[PDB]
Amino acid sequence: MIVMRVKVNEKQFDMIIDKLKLMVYEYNTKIKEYGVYLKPYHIVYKNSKRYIYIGKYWYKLEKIGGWIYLGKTKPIQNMPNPPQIPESTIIKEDNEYIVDEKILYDL
Amino acid sequence: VMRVKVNEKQFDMIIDKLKLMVYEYNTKIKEYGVYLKPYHIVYKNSKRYIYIGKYWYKLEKIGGKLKWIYLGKTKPIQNMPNPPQIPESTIIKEDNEYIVDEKILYDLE
């Protein structure tokens, strides 16, 4: 398959995240009694870049300290089946700045 | 060739040189309760504006939290030592960009 990777801005990225949050709002309040939460994405900083993975990422209610991440496998067998979430990777581009050349005299 | 594009690392270079330019001046004027921050970040028009110039602040006790209050762009007190020459310029942070699969773009409306 020829899979297309294209460039989008922050606002277009925001709608992508918002849509995923909308698609799992139907699931999380229903399964809130199980102490489990389904996050449709995962943000991780590798290779000096912000990686935003898309998928099924689960959480479990904490006990005491001083919501824990369970990974990608569903915890409870007798929980209702989650909605279908697509799997993809988003890589944030390096930040760019419009700069006057004069103030580059700090060399 | 006035205005060009630099990425994050060179942007952090310019920020640090300004902070170093005022570090020893700020230590001298610490007793006055006055801080010269050599830049000003404005999030106007959904974009990170960073303005190069003199920005003076001062310290006071507001409810016990010791909050910084903006003073202006000039020396608040006549008998303070003169500041370093901070240039005047504007830096615009470009809109954040992302590489995304086109399928989830179509499949997420």
Residue A75 domain-assigned? yes
How far is residue A85 from each of residues A14, A30, A34, B51, B108, measured CA to CA in Å?
17, 17, 20, 42, 10
CA–CA separation, B107 and B100 (whole Å): 12
Residues of chain B with C-beta less than 8 angstroms from the C-beta of A54: 104
CB contact under 8 A, B104 and A97: no
Residue A4 domain-assigned? no
In 3-state terms, what secondary structure has residue A34? helix
- The residue length of chain A stands at 107
What single-letter amino acid sits at A85? Answer: I
CA–CA separation, B106 and B109 (whole Å): 5
Residue B51 · residue B93 · CB < 8 Å: no
How far is residue A102 from each of residues B1, B3, B32, B71, B87, measured CA to CA in Å?
10, 9, 33, 27, 10
Residue A45 sits in which domain range? 10-106
Residue B6 · residue A98 · CB < 8 Å: no
CB contact under 8 A, A92 and B96: yes
Structural domain count of chain B: 1
CA–CA separation, A56 and B40 (whole Å): 40
CB contact under 8 A, B14 and A91: no
Residue B2 domain-assigned? no
- Residue A19 DSSP label: H
CA–CA separation, B99 and B101 (whole Å): 7
CA–CA separation, B19 and B69 (whole Å): 19
Residue B1 domain-assigned? no
CA–CA separation, A89 and B47 (whole Å): 25
Residue A1 domain-assigned? no
Which structural technique was applied? X-ray
Residue B84 domain-assigned? yes
In 3-state terms, what secondary structure has residue B98? strand
Residue A39 domain-assigned? yes
B52: β partners: B39, B89
CA–CA separation, A98 and B92 (whole Å): 5
Closest listed residue to residue B93, CA positions, set B7, B15, B2: B7
